Amino acid sequence: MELSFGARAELPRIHPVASKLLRLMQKKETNLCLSADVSLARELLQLADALGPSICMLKTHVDILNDFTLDVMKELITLAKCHEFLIFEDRKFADIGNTVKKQYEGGIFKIASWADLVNAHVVPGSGVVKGLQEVGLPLHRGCLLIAEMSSTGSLATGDYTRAAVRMAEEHSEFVVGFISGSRVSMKPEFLHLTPGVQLEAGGDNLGQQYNSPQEVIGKRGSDIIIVGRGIISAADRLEAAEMYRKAAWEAYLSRLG
Amino acid sequence: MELSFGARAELPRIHPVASKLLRLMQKKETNLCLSADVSLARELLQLADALGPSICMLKTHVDILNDFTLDVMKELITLAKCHEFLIFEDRKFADIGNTVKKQYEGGIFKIASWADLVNAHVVPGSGVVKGLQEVGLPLHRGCLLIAEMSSTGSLATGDYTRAAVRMAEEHSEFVVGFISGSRVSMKPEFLHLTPGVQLEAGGDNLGQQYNSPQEVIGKRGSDIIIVGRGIISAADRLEAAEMYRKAAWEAYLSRLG
Ligand SMILES: Cc1cn([C@H]2C[C@H](O)[C@@H](COP(=O)(O)O)O2)c(=O)[nH]c1=O
Numbered sequence: 001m002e003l004s005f006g007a008r009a010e011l012p013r014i015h016p017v018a019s020k021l022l023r024l025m026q027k028k029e030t031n032l033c034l035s036a037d038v039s040l041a042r043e044l045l046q047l048a049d050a051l052g053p054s055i056c057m058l059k060t061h062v063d064i065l066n067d068f069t070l071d072v073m074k075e076l077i078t079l080a081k082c083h084e085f086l087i088f089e090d091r092k093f094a095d096i097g098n099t100v101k102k103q104y105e106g107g108i109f110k111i112a113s114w115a116d117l118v119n120a121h122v123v124p125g126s127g128v129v130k131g132l133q134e135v136g137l138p139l140h141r142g143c144l145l146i147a148e149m150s151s152t153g154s155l156a157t158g159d160y161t162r163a164a165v166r167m168a169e170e171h172s173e174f175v176v177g178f179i180s181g182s183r184v185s186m187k188p189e190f191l192h193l194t195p196g197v198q199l200e201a202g203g204d205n206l207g208q209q210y211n212s213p214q215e216v217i218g219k220r221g222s223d224i225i226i227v228g229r230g231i232i233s234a235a236d237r238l239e240a241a242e243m244y245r246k247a248a249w250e251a252y253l254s255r256l257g
Numbered sequence: 258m259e260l261s262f263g264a265r266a267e268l269p270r271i272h273p274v275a276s277k278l279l280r281l282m283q284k285k286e287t288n289l290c291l292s293a294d295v296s297l298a299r300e301l302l303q304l305a306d307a308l309g310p311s312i313c314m315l316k317t318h319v320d321i322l323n324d325f326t327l328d329v330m331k332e333l334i335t336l337a338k339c340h341e342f343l344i345f346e347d348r349k350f351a352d353i354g355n356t357v358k359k360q361y362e363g364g365i366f367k368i369a370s371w372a373d374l375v376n377a378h379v380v381p382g383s384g385v386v387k388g389l390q391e392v393g394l395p396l397h398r399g400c401l402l403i404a405e406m407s408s409t410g411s412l413a414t415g416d417y418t419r420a421a422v423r424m425a426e427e428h429s430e431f432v433v434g435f436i437s438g439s440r441v442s443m444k445p446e447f448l449h450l451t452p453g454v455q456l457e458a459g460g461d462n463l464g465q466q467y468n469s470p471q472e473v474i475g476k477r478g479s480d481i482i483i484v485g486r487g488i489i490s491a492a493d494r495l496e497a498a499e500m501y502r503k504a505a506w507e508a509y510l511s512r513l514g
């Protein structure tokens with residue numbers, strides 16, 4: 001018996017960040033996360049403003065933002081609050097717990113001070129989560145664990161995926177879901193976000209592999225599609241975002257029955 | 258048949274950045290990499306200058322450097338040239354090929370412009386290496402693949418480690434070695450760098466596990482020790498670096514018989 005996003009937002013064990021996300025997904029009829037893989041602050045803010053109404057989440061990539069400052073982040077947060085979407089930073093936390101804590105809080109980027117969500121690879125073992133949560137829990141943040149990857153030759157399969165699920169379900173005070181290609185947890189409190197999404201079949205020239213919104217949401221049971229080039233390379237980015245939103249949303253409704 | 262670092266520098270298939278490293282290791286009698294996990298440029302540069310003569314490599318951590326600028330990295334290059342050590346940036350590239358390319362070249366940090374070596378996780382598949390290579394190849398950079406991890410619960414074991422070795426073998430134009438706990442390749446062109454090293458037994462409270470220089474160089478067959486807190490937390494970091502250098506160097510000499 002599958003629950004709607006709005007009902008999942010109310011589950012007793014839901015994490016506050018997941019609840020906030022699920023409520024705005026339901027309100028706005030969007031389960032699309034825009035991957036904003038851009039080099040300029042002006043492009044990031046322009047896309048966030050123009051596409052904000054169509055998205056539940058914006059995945060930032062601050063490591064490639066040539067003119068990052070914390071003032072840009074302040075402005076991005078203003079747009080996120082106005083249009084109602086969460087900010088998910090791309091950075092791949094993937095080190096021992098002692099140093100990921102410093103990477104999350106510190107440096108020039110101060111990721112924990114503006115990202116609602118971050119993601120981590122599980123390869124270090126659960127210390128990666130324990131280190132992140134020492135920063136994320138005081139800042140009321142959530143984390144996604146990379147349980148599967150979309151690229152050719154991915155090693156995030158089999159027992160590796162199972163380890164990611166166990167690590168999430170044992171750190172539910174901080175971990176709110178997964179980056180995955182499919183549903184991997186049977187617990188409805190966890191979110192599933194799927195990159196490697198385009199309307200048409202294909203890939204890229206460096207190992208990316210694409211599946212459609214209907215396949216990943218409808219057949220594979222994921223919750224949210226993450227789309228970069230399928231939107232940003234389109235002539236009309238607003239229309240492209242709307243096409244992806246409508247595709248992902250219908251696929252969700254049809255699985256819901 | 259074990260070869261000295263100086264002889265390995267002359268191997269037919271050696272990459273130019275590995276040859277440079279192996280030659281300075283032999284010249285200076287050091288197989289120590291300092292893990293400069295500090296948040297201030299002045300401390301980084303003071304450590305690089307004082308410990309430069311004792312190290313073959315300095316592992317930077319720019320994501321935690323609160324006052325990073327490219328001018329700081331210019332001064333680090335000057336010290337690296339003066340004292341003869343390589344610069345290895347910590348950032349754990351762990352994305353699809355198309356995005357890691359941009360992360361390596363771009364943003365504020367412009368890692369490829371100053372780092373001799375970078376490291377990647379192999380979980381995405383070989384596209385991670387191909388994307389980095391598209392930037393680093395003409396710059397005579399090299400990459401290290403994370404084949405094993407030192408932390409409790411590491412998933413970099415078994416077939417995962419074997420996949421890392423195969424990926425390195427198959428990309429030897431750019432991959433010059435491993436982050437590992439032991440020798441994982443039989444090919445002497447490859448470097449093995451081992452973190453999780455301290456003179457004393459123990460660990461940390463976030464899953465780090467330590468082994469001694471004698472164990473990891475002498476018994477486990479690795480080439481270089483990566484040492485952070487064992488040096489950084491000492492009152493006199495120069496004396497500590499010298500203790501680690503002598504331990505790792507004499508363990509290496511023991512192998513040669
Ligand atoms: C963990 C993970 C991230 N991503 C990231 C890389 C890009 O920032 C984004 C996909 O962008 P794209 O839609 O332009 O291919 O998602 C994957 O594509 N696959 C994965 O498995």
Ligand SMILES: Cc1cn([C@H]2C[C@H](O)[C@@H](COP(=O)(O)O)O2)c(=O)[nH]c1=O
Nearest residue numbers: 099292405406407436452453484485486
């Ligand atoms: C890939 C990898 C990196 N590292 C990094 C994290 C730190 O920057 C450094 C170890 O620092 P430490 O000597 O203070 O524990 O090396 C590991 O400790 N283990 C690993 O397996």
